[PDB]
Design a protein around this ligand. Structure first.
Ligand SMILES: NCCCC#Cc1cn([C@H]2C[C@H](O)[C@@H](COP(=O)(O)OP(=O)(O)OP(=O)(O)O)O2)c2nc(N)[nH]c(=O)c12
Ligand SMILES: [Mg+2]
Ligand SMILES: [Mg+2]
Ligand SMILES: [Mg+2]
Ligand SMILES: [Mg+2]
Ligand SMILES: [Mg+2]
Length: 539
DNA sequence: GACCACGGCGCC
DNA sequence: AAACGGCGCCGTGGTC
């Protein structure tokens, strides 16, 4: 390309180099733009951002987030990554996309700008005739990137002093557990080492091995294996408790307070738009989509996620979303009727599991039922949920029978989905998002059947993902008008931050927007709560 | 110091 | 672990 002085014309494709991958923490090392056979290199990157009308090109959201960080209202526009991801969700990296669609991902901003221009031209051409994918791009993915950029730049407040105090307390309990484990082992060792633990349990203590690990075939020390050995030796329970505490402390309690941004005083994640095979988002650096909530200590950690002073968090959560989606996709009368009657499958299953009336089902019991309901739906074995429920194999067989027999058209939709998948080479969501599954025609059964479970799950999980994305795009401008903030997305949950005076109105509006985003054969119901912290806002 | 595979596990 | 699906991060063991 012909070198030309900054600034570039309108509609130019940007290229840029960051000191690190996280846009909220990155230094803008270089900035460039390409248009009309010319490349414009910015002598002064930060000031040059002001000359841009939009961030158009590869990883557009990243540059936009950095711009927002610097108080510049620069929205992301066209991004070849989004086009490639829609064509094939295995297109997740700019390295891969460049190689596949015409270029090479380098470390020079000018070459990145030129690459962005070429890739877009080529990828836009491949979207010719793909009207459903084109609809997803224009109406969902492209505007969503703008929404996500604002969310990333906003961040969420965290009670740092609380977590630091909690760390000291957990450390003392960990010390008690590890000391007991070493005593019971008869000698100290690296309890964090599963290799050393394996030898202690199975060679020294002579406990029976239950399972083997996948890649190397070692005797597994997983929680599922330990759960089976809970009554064989006192050391097992102590290890399980050590596992829980060290997991939470090393993953959340200790790292998170060190990740507070010095300018915003808040915690900033990244919402990756081209990272999953189903169309779901992912969250990273740090992952805020896996904040603990199951155990007491876990809930204690979730409490650290708080609203700004004078504000309140609003948590909105779709009700039984994939089951409702399944009802629409399959068209099963029995399942549709269940949601028309306003029933709760999770509660009903949980009542059966613990053998109690459905009014005696606590949140923890209902949570466990989700493993059973979705597990069985997506192909869990009779042997597994017999171990999950600690019931005889024969009973576990019977549950799987009645589950599918209650909803006959579900199995029909699955068989239809798999056959179409074999013929076309891909499955699709309700809106036409695709996932290629070539292993549907594998001659090895274990491989073929594994692919099948991936294949028929994708339209269900993906449709729910499409619906949430659409809801986010619609909801965002409404929130901006109300002075409320969209903070987090957790797959089928949104976390908002609103002024105390407007909290209830925001909750009501967001609920209605989410419920009426795209009507199905069954009503979409959304549970909403308001609180000073994340945990309180979901109760 | 970084990167890796692995086992393991937090969430949806 | 076991024929649930979808993610990212932890420490270990290991290389470079
Ligand atoms: N396994 C430990 C127990 C907690 C859990 C969970 C799961 C959730 N999902 C998918 C299906 C849900 O529709 C979607 C949202 O998760 P959710 O809100 O927790 O569950 P749901 O929306 O069905 O219940 P609720 O929101 O009405 O309480 O994520 C799952 N999908 C699969 N294949 N397996 C799962 O375990 C889960
Ligand atoms: Mg407060
Ligand atoms: Mg939900
Ligand atoms: Mg949820
Ligand atoms: Mg792994
Ligand atoms: Mg290992």
């Amino acid at each position: 390309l012909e070198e030309a002085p900054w600034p570039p014309p309108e509609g130019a494709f940007v290229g840029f180099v960051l000191s690190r991958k996280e846009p909220m923490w990155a230094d803008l090392l270089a900035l460039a733009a390409a248009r009309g056979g010319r490349v414009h290199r910015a002598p002064e990157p930060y000031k040059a951002l002001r000359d841009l009308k939009e961030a158009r090109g590869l990883l557009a959201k990243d540059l936009s987030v950095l711009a927002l960080r610097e108080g510049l209202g620069l929205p992301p526009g066209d991004d070849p990554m989004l086009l490639a991801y829609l064509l094939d969700p295995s297109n997740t990296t700019p390295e891969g996309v460049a190689r596949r669609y015409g270029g090479e991902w380098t470390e020079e901003a000018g070459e990145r700008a030129a690459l962005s221009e070429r890739l877009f031209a080529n990828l836009w051409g491949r979207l010719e005739g793909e009207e459903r994918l084109l609809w997803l791009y224009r109406e969902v993915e492209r505007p969503l990137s703008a929404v996500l950029a604002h969310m990333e730049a906003t961040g969420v407040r965290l009670d740092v002093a609380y977590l630091r105090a909690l760390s000291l307390e957990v450390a003392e309990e960990i010390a008690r557990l590890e000391a007991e484990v070493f005593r019971l082992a008869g000698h100290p060792f690296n309890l964090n080492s599963r290799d050393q633990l394996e030898r202690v349990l199975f060679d020294e203590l002579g406990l029976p091995a239950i399972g083997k690990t996948e890649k190397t075939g070692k005797r597994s020390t997983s929680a599922a294996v330990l759960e089976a050995l809970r009554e064989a030796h006192p050391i097992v329970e102590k290890i399980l408790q050590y596992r829980e505490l060290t997991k939470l402390k090393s993953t959340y309690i200790d790292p998170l307070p060190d990740l507070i941004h010095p300018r915003t005083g808040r915690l900033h994640t990244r919402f990756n738009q081209t990272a999953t095979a189903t169309g779901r988002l992912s969250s990273s650096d740090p992952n805020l989509q896996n904040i603990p909530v199951r155990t007491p200590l876990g809930q204690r950690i979730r409490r650290a996620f708080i609203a700004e002073e004078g504000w309140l968090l609003v948590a909105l959560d779709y009700s039984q979303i994939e089951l409702r989606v399944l009802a629409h996709l399959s068209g099963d009368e029995n399942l549709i009727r269940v949601f028309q009657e306003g029933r709760d499958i999770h509660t009903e299953t949980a009542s059966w599991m613990f053998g109690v009336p459905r009014e005696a089902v606590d949140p923890l019991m209902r949570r466990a039922a989700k493993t059973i309901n979705f597990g069985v739906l997506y192909g869990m074995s009779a042997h597994r949920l017999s171990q999950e429920l600690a019931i005889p194999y024969e009973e576990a067989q019977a549950f799987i029978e009645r589950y599918f027999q209650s909803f006959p058209k579900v199995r029909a939709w699955i068989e239809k989905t798999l056959e179409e998948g074999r013929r076309r080479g891909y499955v699709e969501t309700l809106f036409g998002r695709r996932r290629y599954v070539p292993d549907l025609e594998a001659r090895v059964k274990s491989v073929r059947e594994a692919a099948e479970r991936m294949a028929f799950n994708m339209p269900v999980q993906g449709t729910a993902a499409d619906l949430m994305k659409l809801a986010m795009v619609k909801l965002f401008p409404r929130l901006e008008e109300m002075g409320a903030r969209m903070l987090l997305q957790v797959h089928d949950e949104l976390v908002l931050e609103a002024p105390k005076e407007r909290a209830e109105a925001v909750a009501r509006l967001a609920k209605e927007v989410m419920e009426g985003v795209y009507p199905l054969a069954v009503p979409l119901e959304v549970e909403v709560g308001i609180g000073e912290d994340w945990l309180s806002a979901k109760e």
